[PDB]
Scaffold this active site. Sequence first.
Site, short mmCIF file in Angstrom:
data_model
loop_
_atom_site.label_atom_id
_atom_site.label_comp_id
_atom_site.label_asym_id
_atom_site.label_seq_id
_atom_site.Cartn_x
_atom_site.Cartn_y
_atom_site.Cartn_z
N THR A 175 -4.53 51.43 45.31
CA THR A 175 -6.16 51.14 45.66
C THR A 175 -6.28 50.88 47.11
N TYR A 192 -5.44 43.05 36.97
CA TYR A 192 -5.28 43.22 38.51
C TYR A 192 -6.41 43.72 39.14
N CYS A 193 -6.81 44.92 38.79
CA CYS A 193 -7.73 45.80 38.63
C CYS A 193 -8.80 44.96 39.68
N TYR A 220 -17.63 49.94 26.26
CA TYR A 220 -17.48 48.60 26.87
C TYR A 220 -18.65 48.15 27.68
N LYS A 256 -12.87 55.56 44.05
CA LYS A 256 -11.52 54.51 43.54
C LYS A 256 -12.31 52.82 43.06
N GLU A 272 -4.10 49.56 32.12
CA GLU A 272 -3.02 49.66 31.84
C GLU A 272 -3.07 49.41 29.85
N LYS A 278 -10.00 42.49 41.99
CA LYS A 278 -9.61 42.65 43.70
C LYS A 278 -9.92 43.74 44.50
N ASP A 279 -10.59 45.02 44.13
CA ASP A 279 -11.32 46.13 44.33
C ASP A 279 -12.89 45.76 44.47
N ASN A 283 -14.56 51.50 39.59
CA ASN A 283 -13.86 50.19 39.89
C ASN A 283 -14.83 49.08 39.49
N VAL A 307 1.14 52.41 37.34
CA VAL A 307 1.26 53.27 38.04
C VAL A 307 2.45 54.23 38.01
N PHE A 324 -6.75 56.12 37.81
CA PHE A 324 -7.78 55.92 37.35
C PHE A 324 -7.03 54.71 35.61
N1 LIG Z 1 -2.28 48.68 36.85
C1 LIG Z 1 -3.91 49.04 37.40
O1 LIG Z 1 -4.48 49.20 35.84
C2 LIG Z 1 -4.02 50.26 38.11
C3 LIG Z 1 -4.60 51.57 37.92
C4 LIG Z 1 -4.87 52.18 38.69
C5 LIG Z 1 -4.53 51.94 40.10
N2 LIG Z 1 -3.85 50.78 40.49
C6 LIG Z 1 -3.16 50.47 41.96
O2 LIG Z 1 -1.94 50.67 42.06
C7 LIG Z 1 -1.15 49.87 42.54
C8 LIG Z 1 -0.07 49.70 41.62
O3 LIG Z 1 -0.22 49.06 40.31
P1 LIG Z 1 0.04 48.96 39.23
O4 LIG Z 1 -0.31 48.18 38.48
O5 LIG Z 1 0.93 49.36 39.17
O6 LIG Z 1 1.28 46.75 39.95
P2 LIG Z 1 3.10 46.31 40.00
O7 LIG Z 1 2.72 45.63 39.60
O8 LIG Z 1 2.65 47.55 37.40
O9 LIG Z 1 4.35 47.53 40.18
C9 LIG Z 1 4.37 47.69 41.40
C10 LIG Z 1 5.90 47.60 42.16
O10 LIG Z 1 5.57 47.94 42.69
C11 LIG Z 1 7.59 47.75 43.74
N3 LIG Z 1 7.41 47.05 44.84
C12 LIG Z 1 6.84 45.77 45.59
N4 LIG Z 1 7.09 46.59 46.88
C13 LIG Z 1 8.17 47.49 46.87
C14 LIG Z 1 8.63 48.29 47.93
N5 LIG Z 1 8.20 47.68 49.21
N6 LIG Z 1 9.58 49.63 47.94
C15 LIG Z 1 8.94 49.72 46.28
N7 LIG Z 1 9.18 49.09 45.24
C16 LIG Z 1 7.85 48.46 45.39
C17 LIG Z 1 7.06 45.83 42.59
O11 LIG Z 1 8.59 45.68 41.88
C18 LIG Z 1 6.09 46.15 41.13
O12 LIG Z 1 7.16 46.93 40.19
C19 LIG Z 1 -2.34 48.66 43.06
O13 LIG Z 1 -2.93 49.39 43.89
C20 LIG Z 1 -2.89 48.50 41.60
O14 LIG Z 1 -4.33 48.17 42.74
C21 LIG Z 1 -3.53 49.57 39.11
O1 LIG Z 2 -16.15 45.74 27.84
C1 LIG Z 2 -15.21 44.58 28.34
C2 LIG Z 2 -14.43 45.27 29.31
C3 LIG Z 2 -13.82 45.10 29.90
N1 LIG Z 2 -13.53 43.78 29.47
C4 LIG Z 2 -12.76 43.32 30.87
O2 LIG Z 2 -12.27 43.32 32.24
C5 LIG Z 2 -11.17 43.54 32.87
C6 LIG Z 2 -10.86 44.94 32.68
O3 LIG Z 2 -10.44 45.73 31.40
P1 LIG Z 2 -10.02 47.28 30.83
O4 LIG Z 2 -10.09 48.39 29.84
O5 LIG Z 2 -10.65 48.02 32.10
O6 LIG Z 2 -8.24 47.54 31.91
P2 LIG Z 2 -8.09 47.38 32.83
O7 LIG Z 2 -8.24 46.15 34.10
O8 LIG Z 2 -6.72 48.07 32.32
O9 LIG Z 2 -8.65 49.47 33.57
C7 LIG Z 2 -9.20 49.24 34.32
O10 LIG Z 2 -8.99 49.06 36.20
C8 LIG Z 2 -7.68 49.78 36.48
C9 LIG Z 2 -8.61 51.56 36.66
O11 LIG Z 2 -8.11 52.62 36.56
C10 LIG Z 2 -8.91 51.35 35.37
O12 LIG Z 2 -9.73 52.80 34.91
C11 LIG Z 2 -9.95 50.35 34.78
O13 LIG Z 2 -10.80 50.69 33.94
C12 LIG Z 2 -10.36 43.00 31.51
O14 LIG Z 2 -10.33 41.65 31.43
C13 LIG Z 2 -11.36 43.02 30.16
O15 LIG Z 2 -11.17 42.48 29.39
C14 LIG Z 2 -14.16 42.88 29.18
O16 LIG Z 2 -14.84 41.88 29.19
N2 LIG Z 2 -15.51 43.49 28.88
#
Ligand SMILES: NC(=O)c1ccc[n+]([C@@H]2O[C@H](COP(=O)([O-])OP(=O)(O)OC[C@H]3O[C@@H](n4cnc5c(N)ncnc54)[C@H](O)[C@@H]3O)[C@@H](O)[C@H]2O)c1
Ligand SMILES: O=c1ccn([C@@H]2O[C@H](COP(=O)(O)OP(=O)(O)O[C@H]3OC[C@@H](O)[C@H](O)[C@H]3O)[C@@H](O)[C@H]2O)c(=O)[nH]1
EC number: 1.1.1.22
Lengths: 402, 402
Positions: free
Chosen positions: A118, A259-260, A249, A204, A145, A263-264, A208, A11, A142
Amino acid sequence: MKIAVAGSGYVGLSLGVLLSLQNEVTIVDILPSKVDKINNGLSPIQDEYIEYYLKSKQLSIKATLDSKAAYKEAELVIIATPTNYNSRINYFDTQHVETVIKEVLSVNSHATLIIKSTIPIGFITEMRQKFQTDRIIFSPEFLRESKALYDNLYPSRIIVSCEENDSPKVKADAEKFALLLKSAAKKNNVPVLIMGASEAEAVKLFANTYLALRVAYFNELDTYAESRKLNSHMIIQGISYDDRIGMHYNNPSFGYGGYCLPKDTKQLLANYNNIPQTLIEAIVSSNNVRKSYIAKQIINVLKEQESPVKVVGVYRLIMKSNSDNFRESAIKDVIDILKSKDIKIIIYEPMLNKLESEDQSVLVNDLENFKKQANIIVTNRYDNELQDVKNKVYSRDIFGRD
Amino acid sequence: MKIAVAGSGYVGLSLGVLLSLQNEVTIVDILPSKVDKINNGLSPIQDEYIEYYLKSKQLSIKATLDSKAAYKEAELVIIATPTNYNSRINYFDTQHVETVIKEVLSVNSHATLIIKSTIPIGFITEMRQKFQTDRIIFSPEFLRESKALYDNLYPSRIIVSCEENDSPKVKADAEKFALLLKSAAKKNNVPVLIMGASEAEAVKLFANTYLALRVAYFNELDTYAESRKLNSHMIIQGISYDDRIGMHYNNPSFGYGGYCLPKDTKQLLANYNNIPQTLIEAIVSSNNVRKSYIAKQIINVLKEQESPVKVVGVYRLIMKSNSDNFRESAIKDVIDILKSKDIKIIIYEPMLNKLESEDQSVLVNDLENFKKQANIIVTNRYDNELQDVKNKVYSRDIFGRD
Ligand SMILES: NC(=O)c1ccc[n+]([C@@H]2O[C@H](COP(=O)([O-])OP(=O)(O)OC[C@H]3O[C@@H](n4cnc5c(N)ncnc54)[C@H](O)[C@@H]3O)[C@@H](O)[C@H]2O)c1
Ligand SMILES: O=c1ccn([C@@H]2O[C@H](COP(=O)(O)OP(=O)(O)O[C@H]3OC[C@@H](O)[C@H](O)[C@H]3O)[C@@H](O)[C@H]2O)c(=O)[nH]1
Ligand SMILES: NC(=O)c1ccc[n+]([C@@H]2O[C@H](COP(=O)([O-])OP(=O)(O)OC[C@H]3O[C@@H](n4cnc5c(N)ncnc54)[C@H](O)[C@@H]3O)[C@@H](O)[C@H]2O)c1
Ligand SMILES: O=c1ccn([C@@H]2O[C@H](COP(=O)(O)OP(=O)(O)O[C@H]3OC[C@@H](O)[C@H](O)[C@H]3O)[C@@H](O)[C@H]2O)c(=O)[nH]1
């Protein structure tokens, strides 16, 4: 505009790159490796678009570990630090977001803080009382990865919060942030919604949770199909032709990971406290039940084999198709259950160098040997380089994606 | 071709009309009123397209109560009789389908029997063993009431079952029936799937269960929104802009109703026996929980009123927008709970002439008086003719449809 982004993950990095095209961005992280990589034009994560932008676009982007130097100079601060779900407290551990807010507020008295991480429903309101300010708003992310920047260039929608009685600077900044995201997008008609924080926080979590709901349903349908020996593809295809259900999907797996979603769904369930519901909690338990069921099917395929030792070859630990991490990967819980028995586990994961020092599994990255030793190969998503050992591969993968 | 259709309801009638354009159709029912109506060009149910076809199309369609005379002459028999979910046995009461199969088999030795009625997974196989024949197949129906013929003219897809070891006549008839439905459709590219009976039975149950899942989710989201005093429209709109969730079939209500969703969710849950799952059962309980929650909110709005008598005016009993029946209407369960208390219930339902002789509710079809007497007006879907008493109307309706 000078914008500081706290966090260098999927993000934080994609937003920082996205906004560095016409803004002066500074990304902050607490990991030197990530800062050094960014300052040199490299993405600390696999992402086609981020990689391409760092290398071929003209970006005003620099990274640093000097939080204060970055936050003091900023006009807007975007917080994208971690928010893990903590099993002990039954809630998101929001210390990494809180810690940045405090830091930003101590050296900046004009900048509005925009949280992309989130958070729990009611967190913005809660943070505003704690810090006695209205300069904190939420704008849900939204992105998926492996499509982090892609999803910000072509977003489904843009949401930024602000309250009716917020100061004119904060209402203006909320609007401004929304439009910075809109104009940065390469997509043309992106809907923009401005709503109250709690509403945005809920969007959000409910979004999810719906996605988790969908995977869990198609996984329970698949559990049913495997148990009654039915053609699962035939059933999913038949229900999915209803445009109200859709052909997207809907690919069976060992459970929803990443990751999301994990936990969400738990966070939303906690945010419900005692409000009436049965689906929300079932959506979380369904994943556990699906995992146990999968492990048991593997156990039965195993025991029906005459071999002094029983070896389960786990092909990949990545959490979804094309992923580059194993966060909450469903096959990991399956592995755990299998270990609860007497099954030698070998894992083939190119992206991995070494398993934890105490892990009883054995990492075999020579694919040939892997196949040689595995009695059964367990994989969340099938891959073509497994055709020669096809008949001993167990997977519920149907469509080859997600 | 001469085709006999057992059943004159939404399903039986729309199929019978649909197929009477180029086939010689005979519809059978055990209600004279329905036969007399059909034979005179009238639909025993509100349906724009059925009504129009009976009156303005050239149809070779006739109705009758003489089952045997109809089944003996037929080349194909389509069964669309009732299949209610029976609470005592915890299963669909399939006596009305079984009864027609037996009748058809006793006077016809060549006709293949096609069941359109929603049945338990494993019913075709079960009926084939019981009757010692393979001349019975399933072809699920996906129509919506008020759009019964419409949905057969523009179907999402067509599914007909047949087994690998079925006789050439039955495989040929299954294919033939599928193509009769395809060529009768006015839509051009309708996907056709031929699959095993159990697979087809599952498709139907899983499709409706998904739709029930969707309503229940948006209803639990709404329960949460009302309890935390949040803008529900703002939240649903925010999550629905994700094309993977969609802006359709997402309007909050007092619960999912109608003839199908209620019983099919229960049937699927029973067909699971002990196969692992948590969502399937939660999808059924969610509806009960949503109903109780709604009743309680009404009870609290009531008690907070200073009036010697507390009167709840129920506006409409129809099960969904534009419906012409009240089968499993969610507001009826809400009414029941309210009656469990001391609340006078008045109901305004134009489509109703008299309430059961013992019903404690009072039917007031003069709308003016209705508003006059009601302390609070409870309605599943809001309507414009309620604007003058707007502030005492309780409803969770957001989008004005479904
Ligand atoms: N990953 C996704 O698919 C996704 C999508 C939408 C929203 N989010 C949400 O956004 C947030 C981050 O997710 P992510 O996947 O980017 O995580 P990530 O683990 O890839 O990145 C987190 C980063 O924050 C850094 N960090 C930790 N504490 C810090 C601090 N105190 N100051 C500065 N940097 C710091 C860590 O070193 C790490 O590099 C979470 O709440 C996640 O739920 C994630
Ligand atoms: O048809 C499906 C879709 C998804 N999944 C699983 O569900 C999990 C999530 O899959 P996603 O493609 O959504 O991947 P992501 O976790 O990167 O994205 C998700 O979390 C972050 C949000 O902001 C995204 O909008 C949401 O799609 C994965 O483990 C995936 O393998 C299935 O097993 N089957
Ligand atoms: N209604 C829907 O929206 C819908 C959609 C798809 C599938 N289905 C399924 O199709 C079946 C019928 O549903 P419906 O809504 O058409 O019902 P309906 O109640 O409108 O019609 C049933 C008709 O069958 C007649 N009947 C009963 N026993 C008979 C018998 N032994 N011989 C001849 N006629 C008999 C009844 O008189 C009644 O007219 C059910 O299994 C239902 O679940 C319904
Ligand atoms: O957004 C929605 C949609 C639906 N609903 C409710 O859910 C129930 C079912 O609504 P539908 O529009 O699906 O109506 P129907 O029952 O006629 O059709 C349903 O059952 C028969 C199947 O063949 C159809 O495919 C299925 O849609 C109704 O009580 C409706 O009010 C909501 O409360 N909100």
